[PDB]
Design a protein around this ligand. Structure first.
Ligand SMILES: CN(C)[C@@H]1CCc2cc(N3CC[C@H](NS(=O)(=O)c4ccc5cc(Cl)ccc5c4)C3=O)ccc21
Ligand SMILES: [Ca+2]
Ligand SMILES: [Mg+2]
Lengths: 52, 234
């Protein structure tokens, strides 16, 4: 288990292996956090989240 | 939905219900965005005129979150076949945008490779709808959800009397009395990953409901992510 195969490469959502390293990204309506791993909702009612 | 539990307040916010002239649900849908609903192409023959209702959990009471939307454009996959139910997918563009609120929010569209490798390899997915609670019963008045195990592709082909195409996958149980059923068609199959729910399937067909040695057959959303993206741009 390496990179994206090891615990999703520590990414909150999408994980890609580029140049033999992990690249994280997020669904539309989320912004990649400063740590380049977490996904932060850009506005209210982000996709995929149960309400309240 | 046979077996499973009621969707509780806020738990299934991406559920859409296709309603006929009599204001009765006949199929489900998944909210993708303020303008678009994902559904099954085969649902588009079960009513001449239909609208989309969102934010409903009990068809017998006004809970204040419900909203009915007229459809502006129906985008059916051109390769859909009634013979096999291959390419059983359609996108609906609404005339007015959905206002997100409690019980009304979209499910996330995943990327293909990551979803196939990481979501579809999870133990289970979640199916939901207002469909029958038993094979011979009436439609549920309550929105229900059910955790359904992903089924090994070979096991599914072996169980099926009919062709399982590359555009389909199987989920549910061998003998346990839990499955989607009549009226759940077109509804969401979502997969949870770190408390975020991604669209992974569309309720498509089954040889009965919850039958022994039979599984639920779902449209494989990951095979249609580019198609969906294109449909949502026009
Ligand atoms: C013939 N060919 C087009 C394909 C392959 C065999 C088949 C069976 C069915 N049937 C037969 C009855 C059943 N109807 S249902 O309302 O009970 C129903 C409808 C959708 C379902 C969806 C799932 Cl995931 C599970 C059970 C489901 C049950 C249903 O969907 C429809 C299409 C096809
Ligand atoms: Ca209601
Ligand atoms: Mg079964």
């Amino acid at each position: 288990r390496k990179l994206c195969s090891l615990d999703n490469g520590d990414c909150d959502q999408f994980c890609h292996e580029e140049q033999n390293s992990v690249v994280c990204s997020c669904a539309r309506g989320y912004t990649l956090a400063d740590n380049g791993k977490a996904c932060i909702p850009t506005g209210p009612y982000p996709c995929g989240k149960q309400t309240l | 939905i046979v077996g499973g539990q009621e969707c509780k307040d806020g738990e299934c916010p991406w559920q859409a219900l296709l309603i006929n002239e009599e204001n009765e649900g006949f199929c489900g849908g998944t909210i993708l965005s303020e303008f678009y609903i994902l559904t099954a192409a085969h649902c588009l023959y079960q009513a001449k005129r239909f609208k989309v209702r969102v934010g409903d959990r009990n068809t017998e009471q006004e809970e204040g979150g419900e909203a009915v939307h007229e459809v502006e454009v129906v985008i059916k996959h051109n390769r859909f076949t009634k013979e096999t139910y291959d390419f059983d997918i359609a996108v609906l563009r609404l005339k007015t945008p959905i206002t997100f609120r409690m019980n009304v929010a979209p499910a996330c569209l995943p990327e293909r490779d990551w979803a196939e490798s990481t979501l579809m390899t999870q133990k289970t997915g979640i199916v939901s709808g207002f469909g029958r609670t038993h094979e011979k019963g009436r439609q549920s008045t309550r929105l229900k959800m059910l955790e359904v195990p992903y089924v090994d592709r070979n096991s599914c082909k072996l169980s099926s009397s009919f062709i399982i195409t590359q555009n389909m996958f199987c989920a549910g149980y061998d003998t346990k009395q839990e499955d989607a059923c009549q009226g759940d068609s077109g509804g969401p199959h979502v997969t949870r990953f770190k408390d975020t729910y991604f669209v992974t399937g569309i309720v498509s067909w089954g040889e009965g409901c919850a039958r022994k040695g039979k599984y639920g057959i779902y449209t494989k959303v990951t095979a249609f992510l580019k198609w969906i993206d294109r449909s949502m741009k026009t």
